[PDB]
Design an enzyme around this catalytic site. Sequence first.
Site, PDB file in Angstrom:
ATOM      1  N   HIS A  41       0.813  -1.220   0.000  1.00  0.00           N
ATOM      2  CA  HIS A  41       0.000   0.000   0.000  1.00  0.00           C
ATOM      3  C   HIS A  41       0.854   1.281   0.000  1.00  0.00           C
ATOM      4  O   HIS A  41       0.289   2.352  -0.136  1.00  0.00           O
ATOM      5  CB  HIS A  41      -1.084   0.021   1.090  1.00  0.00           C
ATOM      6  CG  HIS A  41      -0.600   0.249   2.487  1.00  0.00           C
ATOM      7  ND1 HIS A  41      -0.610  -0.771   3.425  1.00  0.00           N
ATOM      8  CD2 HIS A  41      -0.183   1.387   3.090  1.00  0.00           C
ATOM      9  CE1 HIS A  41      -0.158  -0.233   4.549  1.00  0.00           C
ATOM     10  NE2 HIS A  41       0.132   1.055   4.392  1.00  0.00           N
ATOM     11  N   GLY A 143       2.309   5.804   9.578  1.00  0.00           N
ATOM     12  CA  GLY A 143       3.742   5.799   9.343  1.00  0.00           C
ATOM     13  C   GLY A 143       4.409   4.539   9.879  1.00  0.00           C
ATOM     14  O   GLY A 143       5.526   4.220   9.467  1.00  0.00           O
ATOM     15  N   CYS A 145       3.478   1.456   9.320  1.00  0.00           N
ATOM     16  CA  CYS A 145       3.362   0.324   8.392  1.00  0.00           C
ATOM     17  C   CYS A 145       4.726  -0.129   7.907  1.00  0.00           C
ATOM     18  O   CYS A 145       5.628   0.691   7.762  1.00  0.00           O
ATOM     19  CB  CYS A 145       2.420   0.641   7.238  1.00  0.00           C
ATOM     20  SG  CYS A 145       0.765   1.116   7.791  1.00  0.00           S
TER      21      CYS A 145
HETATM   22  C1  LIG Z   1      -3.374   4.907   9.838  1.00  0.00           C
HETATM   23  C2  LIG Z   1      -2.707   3.678  10.404  1.00  0.00           C
HETATM   24  C3  LIG Z   1      -2.422   3.593  11.761  1.00  0.00           C
HETATM   25  C4  LIG Z   1      -1.866   2.436  12.270  1.00  0.00           C
HETATM   26  N1  LIG Z   1      -1.579   1.364  11.525  1.00  0.00           N
HETATM   27  C5  LIG Z   1      -1.843   1.437  10.218  1.00  0.00           C
HETATM   28  C6  LIG Z   1      -2.403   2.560   9.606  1.00  0.00           C
HETATM   29  N2  LIG Z   1      -2.705   2.578   8.225  1.00  0.00           N
HETATM   30  C7  LIG Z   1      -3.737   1.920   7.656  1.00  0.00           C
HETATM   31  O1  LIG Z   1      -4.530   1.217   8.276  1.00  0.00           O
HETATM   32  C8  LIG Z   1      -3.849   2.103   6.163  1.00  0.00           C
HETATM   33  C9  LIG Z   1      -5.147   2.861   5.877  1.00  0.00           C
HETATM   34  C10 LIG Z   1      -3.839   0.717   5.494  1.00  0.00           C
HETATM   35  C11 LIG Z   1      -4.148   0.675   4.001  1.00  0.00           C
HETATM   36  C12 LIG Z   1      -5.456   0.115   3.541  1.00  0.00           C
HETATM   37  C13 LIG Z   1      -4.194  -0.644   3.310  1.00  0.00           C
END
Ligand SMILES: Cc1ccncc1NC(=O)[C@H](C)CC1CC1
EC number: 3.4.19.12
Lengths: 304, 304
Positions: A41, A143, A145
């Site tokens: 992503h 951030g 991820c």
């Molecule tokens: C914001 C956040 C805070 C903690 N961990 C992760 C995130 N990020 C997401 O969940 C994004 C939207 C994933 C994407 C759809 C594939």
Amino acid sequence: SGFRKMAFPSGKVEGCMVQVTCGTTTLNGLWLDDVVYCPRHVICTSEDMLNPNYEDLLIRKSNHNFLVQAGNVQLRVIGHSMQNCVLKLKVDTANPKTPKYKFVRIQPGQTFSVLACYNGSPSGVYQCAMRPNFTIKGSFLNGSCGSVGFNIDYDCVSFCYMHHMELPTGVHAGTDLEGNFYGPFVDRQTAQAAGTDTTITVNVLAWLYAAVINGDRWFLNRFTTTLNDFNLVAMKYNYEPLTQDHVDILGPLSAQTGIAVLDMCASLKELLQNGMNGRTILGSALLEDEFTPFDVVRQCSGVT
Amino acid sequence: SGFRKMAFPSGKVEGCMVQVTCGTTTLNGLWLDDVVYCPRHVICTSEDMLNPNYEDLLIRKSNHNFLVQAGNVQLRVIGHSMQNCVLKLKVDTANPKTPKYKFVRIQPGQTFSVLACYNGSPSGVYQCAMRPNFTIKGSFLNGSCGSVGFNIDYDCVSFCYMHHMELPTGVHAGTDLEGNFYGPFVDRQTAQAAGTDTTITVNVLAWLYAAVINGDRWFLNRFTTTLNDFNLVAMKYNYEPLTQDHVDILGPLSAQTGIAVLDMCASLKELLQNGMNGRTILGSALLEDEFTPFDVVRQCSGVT
Ligand SMILES: Cc1ccncc1NC(=O)[C@H](C)CC1CC1
Ligand SMILES: Cc1ccncc1NC(=O)[C@H](C)CC1CC1
């Protein structure tokens, strides 16, 4: 003595963390040998995340669009490929700090350490369990991820998790290092059902053994139970059914303390049915399930 | 979102751990620049520990008696000296992995990460608080002496603790890196009174703010209190009295959430007087005090 929620030393993993940028999105990558692994992503923009067509989005990207930075040095990307939900960026330099490693898919109920990172920089390390429903209750902000989960057996790091997403419920979802999600999750900004979770019974029993080893014994009683009787109580309290395989793994702890596994089950049954009565076990006022029997043996013997 | 008992990444500290042997005793040392720091009780035998005469015991030792091993390489000891309860072994080689560092004496109520080690090898990392009574509730077995506590501010490691002893109560005591014990403790195998401990009030309030930030809000009420009224409750429940300095440090969290510090104190007062009623806050069934307001701000903002 003493018993803590201990994470593995994160040094070997810190040396693999890099920052990956694609377009306006920055997240963490894991640099092992000449490959950088990161959540796919990273190639998405805000409009894409509701239902990204990853294949189409990746086709618009070239090697030079993936900005990989290790500390302050730039890595040259000579290849890119998507494997499930991860991108593998082939780089022209092998990470000099690559430890001995394996990619493993852990089972639900197993534990691991997470090295939370932002912009390729490590912020902290914590131990957690993969829930029976394949979510993790971590600490991740935007951030984070690409931050990874792992176990360490002497000099070998077994990477088991890569963080991808926060569900609308505030629980976390991610993949193994081949990019396969744990659980039914998809990498889309959509509401997704996480299954009914249960408490990891074998882990609670392991932690009760850790408690006895360290002096907390008030919960030991004059009772015993059977696997069938205990599982009727486990059912009522949303605990995972105990099997002989779980009893077998508790063998070393039962041998050390001299408390038969079914006798410890009777203590757990009484605690489930009566609560703690305002008392604590190993500094906790609830039944802890983030320690496997292997974790207890390791911590109680000082394995390095 | 999510809030975990996070330790600092232990990498910079792992690179400083060494094994120190003197006679038949082996423990951990901290190699920074050309000096190895370790607990002076490494020079003791079982007969000595009831009341060691460290000066006399050290006089029988020469540089060649201190066996310092970093991983698998031997360090050459060219000097030795005792400073309070630590030995400083001057070595002929500066540690190539010495990070930017400071030695700091932390205050009671402050938190830090511990890198538990055995035979100079890291086994795990956990976060803990220095209790108001100067003990730590860690996880240490025989051989863990010399394991250190620390904080990290970007690239600088502030070493604040070195493990020396387990009290007969199973709680831990140690020194700053100049070998001064925290608390009234002496490095002798003797029963030693640890003062009456209290719960770190400013930390519990900080953790209540962390809970609100992350969605756990059930404990917020329609009440307020004063520092005087709150301190009457804190007294009854063995909580540290709250001062304006503590209120001032909670400022950023009060500003972020819009919940006045005295309103959060009224929530804490109600929780102290009524308990959790079988509910949880951030996965805990008790009032957590091992997160400082700085820890909460750092974790909630993703500081690396
Ligand atoms: C914001 C956040 C805070 C903690 N961990 C992760 C995130 N990020 C997401 O969940 C994004 C939207 C994933 C994407 C759809 C594939
Ligand atoms: C056994 C142990 C387990 C955990 N932590 C530390 C230890 N060691 C000690 O307490 C020794 C007796 C200290 C010496 C008197 C100065």
